Amino acid sequence: KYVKLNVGGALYYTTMQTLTKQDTMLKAMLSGRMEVLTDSEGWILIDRCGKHFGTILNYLRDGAVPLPESRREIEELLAEAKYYLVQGLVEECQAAL
Amino acid sequence: KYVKLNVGGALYYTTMQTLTKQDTMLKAMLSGRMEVLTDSEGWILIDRCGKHFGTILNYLRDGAVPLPESRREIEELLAEAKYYLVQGLVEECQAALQN
Amino acid sequence: SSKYVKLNVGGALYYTTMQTLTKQDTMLKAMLSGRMEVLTDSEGWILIDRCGKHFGTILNYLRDGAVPLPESRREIEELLAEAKYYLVQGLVEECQAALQN
Amino acid sequence: SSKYVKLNVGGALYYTTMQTLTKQDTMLKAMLSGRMEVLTDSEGWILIDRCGKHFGTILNYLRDGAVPLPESRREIEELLAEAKYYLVQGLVEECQAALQN
Ligand SMILES: [Hg+2]
Ligand SMILES: [Hg+2]
Ligand SMILES: [Hg+2]
Ligand SMILES: [Hg+2]
């Protein structure tokens, strides 16, 4: 089954399978182990920038993702990784630095 | 004739001729060789990022496509190419990564 | 009456929000504020007679307030035309500046 | 007026307006003036048996009256061929001029 998320105005479409693949905030969001905030149209709202959210979804899907080149973009990706509790990507970004 | 796909929230409108032109998983989706899940508006849902999907559609249509400059986007494309079993583009992306 | 927006830009399909399109003062904000005439189809897509090649970049500039410009002079010029058309004042300058390199 | 026209050019899908296609004297104007046969499908797409690589560039030249030209001579020749075919005389001249070494 598919889940649709509004992350800072950026719209995403993914599955329960992807968001529950790793131990993260998103799994906790969908396991019912945490409240999720939805609107009238059924979008899970997240008050974060959606710039790198697409990168997070890819990491969950493939278990790996190409990291950004510039150090600043690595920190941006890292910040989101820490927030969503994607420990694998957090470490991998810390390693890249 | 025309197919409309929701790829990771990115919406696309293409043709059957394009999606079935080469031997890939996308051909298999519409060759009836596979399950297709659509939403209320009739958009075929695909749980992949749609960033490079436009590039995938063009490769199937034209048999060739301009690759991105940075190594990062080529690798991103390679991941999508590998997933959809676009073997032709996979090779050129693997090849493009020379340095 | 929705905050979710779907736009047909020259045949290129985009799905975005009011939150992104109203971040800066541009033609797109006036278009969705009802402050301007809009042409929609049966399925609820606002039609826009411009190429959608660089439109994704326009949306990202509105979202993040900045975007990586293309390398070649040709594509910066392409973006400049789109930025100017949508009256994206921030992006117009940065691209006009980029051509003075 | 501002009615929408959609063309399938070699598999590339485009959305433009009557206003754009009738701005200049070209083959595309003749297509909508009924001065020439157009083949449409069940969904209302005007079919054109041409590669759609540069058609977006043709549409932009009609929209803005100008467009950034490609760098390489080969791509200028490609665009020039399409301009000649669609009878976009304005763009033909600028492409012929660009190939002046
Ligand atoms: Hg992505
Ligand atoms: Hg951001
Ligand atoms: Hg071509
Ligand atoms: Hg274009």
Author numbering:
A (entry chain C): 32 to 128
B (entry chain D): 32 to 130
C (entry chain B), D (entry chain A): 30 to 130
Paper text:
KCTD10 is implicated in heart morphogenesis and congenital heart failure through regulation of Tbx5 and Notch1. In contrast, a novel tetrameric assembly with two-fold rotational symmetry is observed for both KCTD10 and KCTD13. A second interface is additionally evident in the tetrameric structures of KCTD10 and KCTD13 as visualized by an antiparallel arrangement of two β1–β2 hairpins. Whereas the canonical interface contributes 1210 Å2 to the total tetramer interface in KCTD10, the second interface contributes 940 Å2. For instance, the scattering curve for KCTD10 was virtually identical with that calculated for the two-fold symmetric tetramer observed in its crystal, while being distinct from the predicted solution scattering curve for a symmetric tetramer such as that observed for the T1 domain found attached to potassium channels. Interestingly, KCTD10 and KCTD13 also exhibited retention times and MALS scattering that were consistent with mixtures of monomers and dimers, indicating that these crystallographic tetramers were not stable in solution at lower protein concentrations (<50 µM monomer concentration compared with ∼750 µM used in SAXS experiments). Overall, the BTB domains displayed a range of affinities from low-to-high nanomolar: KCTD17 (Kd = 7 nM) > KCTD5 (Kd = 55 nM) > SHKBP1 (Kd = 87 nM) > KCTD13 (Kd = 100 nM), KCTD10 (Kd = 460 nM). Our crystal structures of KCTD10 and KCTD13 represent the first structures of family members from clade C. Unexpectedly, both proteins crystallized as two-fold symmetric tetramers revealing a different complex architecture to other KCTD families characterized to date. These structures were also notably distinct from the four-fold rotationally symmetric tetramer of the Kv4.3 BTB domain. It remains unclear if all KCTD family members would form KCTD5-like pentameric assemblies, or if for instance full-length KCTD10 or KCTD13, which belong to a relatively diverged clade, would retain tetrameric forms similar to their isolated BTB domain structures.
The human KCTD family contains 25 soluble proteins that share a conserved potassium (K+) Channel Tetramerization Domain (a subtype of ‘BTB domain’) at their N-termini and have variable C-termini. The BTB fold of the Kv and KCTD families has a roughly pyramidal wedge shape and consists of five α-helices and a single β-sheet made from three β-strands. Here, we present novel X-ray crystal structures of the BTB domains of a further five members of the KCTD family and examine the stoichiometry and stability of their multimeric assemblies in solution. Overall, the pyramidal wedge shape of the KCTD family BTB domain creates a versatile scaffold compatible with a range of oligomeric assemblies and geometries that may impact function.
